[PDB]
Amino acid sequence: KQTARKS
Amino acid sequence: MASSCAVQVKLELGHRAQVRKKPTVEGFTHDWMVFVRGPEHSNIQHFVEKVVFHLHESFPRPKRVCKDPPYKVEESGYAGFILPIEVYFKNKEEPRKVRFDYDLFLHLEGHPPVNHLRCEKLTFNNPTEDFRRKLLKA
């Protein structure tokens, strides 16, 4: 449900 | 000097995120806006010196400083991330600031836009007279 994420 | 005083102030942190009809040239799929405000349009500038939004290192000039309201950043991007937010106070002593790790999350295309609200309470025990009067104008 969320997009991908950065870190 | 027997009397003592605890002052609470409410902060609202939040963000909106929506898929762009047309992605940007860089491939940014979302427009988003993150903010810090008082509830019910109250005026936190009485005690807030500035709000610093620390954007992901992939953003240019990632330390975004808002010395004046609205305390917000509007950007475009492709992915969510942890966004540290510091609220600095019109304070001469401790605490000079408070920090929140804000989860700037985005929803995939095909889901409703993000409209997220995060309430936080701040407590100041026996603030200085000057700070107390600033806090209580908000």
Numbering used by the authors:
A (entry chain B): 4 to 10
B (entry chain A): 1 to 138
Authors' own words:
One of the major and widespread PTMs is acylation of the ε-amino group of lysine residues. Canonical acyllysine readers, bromodomain and double PHD finger (DPF), display comparable binding capabilities toward various short acyl chain modifications, and while the YEATS domain exhibits preference for crotonyllysine, it still associates albeit more weakly with other acyllysine marks. In this study, we elucidate the significance of π stacking components in targeting of acetyllysines by the YEATS domains and report a previously uncharacterized DNA-binding activity of the human AF9-YEATS domain. Collectively, our results have illuminated the mechanistic basis underlying distinct recognition of acyllysine PTMs by the YEATS domains of yeast Taf14 and human AF9, allowing us to develop a Taf14-YEATS module that selects for the crotonyl modification and discriminates against saturated acyl modifications.
Alignment of the YEATS domain sequences derived from the family of human and yeast proteins shows conservation of the WG motif (W81 and G82 in Taf14) in all YEATS members but AF9 and ENL, which instead contain a YA motif. To compare the binding modes of the YEATS domains harboring the WG and YA motifs, we determined the structure of AF9-YEATS in complex with H3K9bu peptide. Structural overlay of the AF9-YEATS:H3K9bu and previously reported AF9-YEATS:H3K9cr17 complexes showed that both saturated and unsaturated four-carbon acyl chains of K9 are bound by the three aromatic residues Y78, F59, and F28 in a very similar way. However, neither Y78 nor F28 appear to form π-π-π stacking with the alkene group of crotonyllysine as only a single carbon atom in Y78 (Cε) or F28 (Cε) was close enough to the C = C carbon atoms to fully engage the double bond (red dashed lines).
